[model samples]
Target: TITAMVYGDDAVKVQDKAASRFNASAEAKKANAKVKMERIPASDYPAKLRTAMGSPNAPDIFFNWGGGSIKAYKEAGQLVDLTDVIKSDEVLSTGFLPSVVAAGSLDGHEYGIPMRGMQPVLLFYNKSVFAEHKLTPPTTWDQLLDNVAKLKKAGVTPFALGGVEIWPELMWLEYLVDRIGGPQVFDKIRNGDASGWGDPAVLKAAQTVKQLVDEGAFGKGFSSVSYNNGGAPALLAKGKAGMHLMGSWEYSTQLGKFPDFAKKDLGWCAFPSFEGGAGDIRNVVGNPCNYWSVNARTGNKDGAIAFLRDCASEAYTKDLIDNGDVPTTTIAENMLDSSPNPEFAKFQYQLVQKAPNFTLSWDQAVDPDWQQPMLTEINKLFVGKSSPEQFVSALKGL
Candidate 1:
C-alpha cells in the first residue's frame, strides 16, 4: 500500500492525476502486486507525520516537499537512508541536474531522487494587463518598480502576495535578500556563519519588501490574505492583479483550471534585477520540488529503493516532463513543447545552462523550528507592524 497525504488545500485533480500515473506505470510492468494509494486531506502533514511515524502501519511511501521537511524526517531516523541506493544509481547520478541533486542531499547523504526541480521567481503577468499598461516586463530594477508603480496608479494591484501563511511570503523576501546581499551573504546568515542580522544586506532586503508594502504595490489587505484562500486565485483569474511572484509549479494549476486563459495571455520572466545589487541578476534562488527518499527503518528497504530508482528513470522522466514538471533529468529541448507553459520550461532550461551559482530556496533551507516564526516576523514587516530592523532581529534570534 502506498499512501501520499497531499495538502488539504491542494487540488483533488492533481493528486488524482499522479495516482493514476503511478498505477499505470505499475500495471505496465506486469507486476500483479496491488498498489493502494490514499489521499488524506491534512492541513498539517508534518505534525501529523510526527504522530503517524510511531505506528508500524504508516504508509510505505509518501510524498513530501524536499528541503527542511525531508531533513526533519531524516534526522528523526524515521526515513530510510538511501545512501547506498543513490551512490550505486548511475542513471540518476548522470541524468539529473547537479544543483537539484545536491539540494536533495544533506551532510553528504542522498535522501531522495528529485522528481521536479523548480525555482526562478518569475512574474506571471496577464498579456492584456501588460499591453494596457504599456509594460514590457521590465528588465532592470528601477523599471520593474516603476512598472509596478504604474499599475498601482491605474488602481490595479501591481503584485499579488499573501502574507498570512508567512512561509509563502518569505519566498519573496529571501529572493530579495539574495538580490541585495548576493547568494553568499544569505548563505552565511542561513548557516549560522554570522552572529546576527546586523548585516546591511539583510536589512536592505527587509527594507525592499517594506518599500513594496508602503507603496501599496501589493494589493490592499494583502498582508492578511491567505495564499490560496485569497491571493493566488485573484491574481491568476481576474485582471485585478498585475503580476504574481511564484515559481513555474503554478503553471499546471493555472492552465488546468483556467481553460479560457490562452498561452499568449500569460507570460513569465526571470526575477527582475535590482539596481546596484550586490549580486548579478543571474544569482537565482531555487530548489528541487520533489525528492523521493527511502525510510531507513522500513522492512521493505530494497523495494522502496527500487521504486525510487524506477521513478527517476528515463520513462518516468518523460512522464514528469509531459506533466509540466521541470525535469532534473537532462532531456531533449523538444520535450518542453508538451508543457502547459512551454515558455517557462524553455526559460528554466536557459537558466540551468547559464547560471553559474544556483542557491536553494533560502526560506526553506533554514532551521525547521525557525520556519513559522521567521515568516511571522516577515509578515509583520509587510503589514507595517514591525520595522525592518525589528524583522531582521527576530530573524536572527538566538
Candidate 2:
C-alpha cells in the first residue's frame, strides 16, 4: 500500500475521496497498487512528521506549505525533486498557474505540487464608496494618493485595517519593500542575511508605512479593531472605509458574513506601483501555500506519481471549487462558471498566472526566534511606539 499523509481538517475529505477514487481507478490496478491515506492532527504536525521521517516508517507522499517550510525536508534527502517530473509529465505540463508553480520551490528547484487553494494578498476596495467619490482603482503611487485624499475629504477612512492584529499591518510593508527594492530585498533576508533589514528598501517601506499612519490612512481607533471579531471588514462593508488590503479569503469572509455588500460592492486590484520601483506591477505577496510532495524513500514511485496525476483531473479541480477554494490548475479558467463568483474566481486565476514573482509572507519566512520580535517591532511602528529608524535598527539587532 502507498502511504500519503495529510493534515486533519474539513479539507481532508477532499484528499480522502481522492484516495478512494484513485484506488478504484484502472490506473491503480494497472500498477498493482492500493493506497493508504492517513490524516494527521494539526497539533504539532511538523514534529510528528520529523519523528516519522527519521524512522523507516516515513510516508510515501505528504502535504506542506512549500518553499521554506519544506527546505529542511529537501535537504535531509526526504523529498523527491519534481522539476523534471513537472516538466515532462503529460498530466501536469499544462496543470497549474505559472507563478504558483514557481512559488512551490526554493533556490530554484521544484519538490511539491499544488493541491489546495491559493491565498494571494489583494487590494480590496469598497465599490460603492469609490463610485460615490468618482474614484477609479489606482495603478500608480500618485493615483493612489489622490484617491486617498479624495476619500479622506469625503470623510471615509482611506483604508480599513484590523490593527489589533499586527499581521494585517505587515502586508503593507511586505508589498512596499518588494516594490521598492524588488523581491530580492527579502530574498536576501529569507536566505539568512540579517543585514537585509538594513537594505534601503526595508527602511523605505517602514517610512512609507509611518507616512500612511500619520496621514490617517487606516483611521484613528484602528489599533482597537480586530479582524477576527469583524471590525475592519465591517468598516469596508458599511462604506466607512474606501480600501482594504487583505487576503483572497476576504471574498469568502464577506460572502459569508455580509452577502449583500459582498455581492454588490466588492472590488479588487493588484497593489499599485511606485514610480520607479524595481518590482513589476504583477508581483504578488502571500503564502507559497498548500502543496503535496513525494518522499524520496517511497516504496512505490510509480503508484505515487500516478496518484498525484489525479490532482490535475477535472474531478479533483471541481471538488476544490465546490469546497469554495480557488482552483490553481491552468484549466480552472474554463471551470470558473461553477464557482460561487465566476468573474472574481477567473480574475484571481489570471492575476496569479501573470505575476512575475510571488513572495511568501515574511512572518512565515523568518526564523522562529525572530518571528515575535519582528512583529513586536512592526506593532511598535504602527501603534506609534517606534519610529521608522527605530524599527529597522531593532530588527537588525534580531
Candidate 3:
C-alpha cells in the first residue's frame, strides 16, 4: 500500500472517491498496489509534514504547496525528481496547465504534480455594497483608490483585511510588485537572489501598501480581524466592508458560513493594474495549487508513480469539479460547467489561462528557513512597527 498524506478539509470526499477509483482500476490491480491516505488538519499540516519528512516513518507520497514547502526536503535529497517521470508519459506531461506545472516546480526541475485545485488571489466585493455606492470593480489602481475613498465616505470599511494573519497582508505586496515591475521582481527573490528585494519595485510596492493603510482602506482595527475565525469574511457578507482581497477559496468560505450572501452578494474581479507600470495586468500571485510529491525513499516507487497518474484522470478531474474546485488538469476546462458556480469557475480558469505570470505566495516561495522571519517583518510593516524603507532593508538582509 502506498500511504498518501493529505490535508484535512471538505475536499476529503473528493479524495476518498479518487482513492477508491484508483484502487479499483486495472492499473492498480496489475501493480498490486492500493493507496492508504492519512488526513492531517490544515492548521497542523505544514509542521507535521516537516517532522514526518525528517523521520523514518514519512509517507510514501504526500501533499505540498510546492516552492518553499518542499525546498528543504528537496535540498536534503528527500524528494523524488519527477522530471523524467513526467517527460516519459504523455498523460503526465500534458495533463495539467503549463502554468501550474511551472509554478509547482523548483529550479527548472519537476518534483510535484498538481493534485488539488487552483487558488489565485482575487479582488472580491459585495455586489449590493457596490450597487448601493454606485461603484463597480476597479480595473486600475487609481480607480481602486477612488472606490476606497467613496466606500469610506459611505461609512464602510473599503477592504476587509485579516491582518492578524500576516499572510493576508502579504497579498497586497505580492500584487503591487507584480503590477509595478512584473513577476521578475519576486522571481529573483524566490530564487535566492537577495538583491531582488532591493528592486525599486519592492520599495514602490511597500509605499503603495502604506498608501492603502494611511487612506483607511482596511479601516482602523483591520489588524485585529482574523480570517481563520471568519471575522473578515463576515464583515464583507454583512456589508460592513465593501471589498475583500482574498483567494478563490473565499467563495466556498462564505458559502459555508453565510450561504445567502455567498449566492447573491459575492462578486470577484482581478487585481487592478498600476498606471504606466512595467508589469502586464494579466500577471497573478497566490498559491497555485496543492501538489502530490513522491518521497525518494519510498520502497514502492512504481506503485507510487502509478497511483499519481490518477491525478490526471478524467474521473479525478470530475470529482474535483463536483467538490467546488477549479481543477488545473488540462481536461478540466471543458468540465467546469458541472461546478457549483459555473460562471465563477470559468472566470477563474480563464484568469489563470491568460495570466503572463503567476507568482507563488511569498511565504511559500521563500526558503522554509526564512518564512517566519519574513512574516515577522511583514507584520511589523502592517502595524506601523517598520517603515517601508525598513521593510526593504529587512528583506535585503534575509
- Per-model TM-score, in order, reads 0.88, 0.77, 0.92
Instruction: Looking at model 2, report the run of 10 residues with the lowest lDDT sum.
Output: 41-50
Q: How do the candidates rank by TM-score, highest first?
A: 3, 1, 2
Q: Name model 2 segments beyond 4 Å from true.
A: 1-63, 76-94, 97-99, 107-109, 149-155, 221-231, 276-278, 294-307, 322-326, 366-372
Candidate number with the higher lDDT (1 or 2):
2
| Candidate 3 residue pairs that clash | none
What tens-digit string does per-residue lDDT give for candidate 2 at 8-68? Answer: 7556677888888999899999887887877887544556766777878888988877765
Ranking by lDDT: 3, 2, 1
Question: Which regions of candidate 1 fall more than 4 Å away from where they truly are?
Answer: 5-18, 21-34, 38-43, 89-95, 193-196, 313-315, 332-334
TM-score (C-alpha, index-matched) for candidate 2: 0.77
Whose lDDT is higher: candidate 1's or candidate 3's? 3
lDDT of each: 0.66, 0.83, 0.89
TM-score of 3: 0.92
Ten-residue stretch with the least lDDT total in model 3: 7-16
Candidate 3 lDDT, 216-271, residue by residue in tens:
99899988898777898999999999999998878777877788998889999999
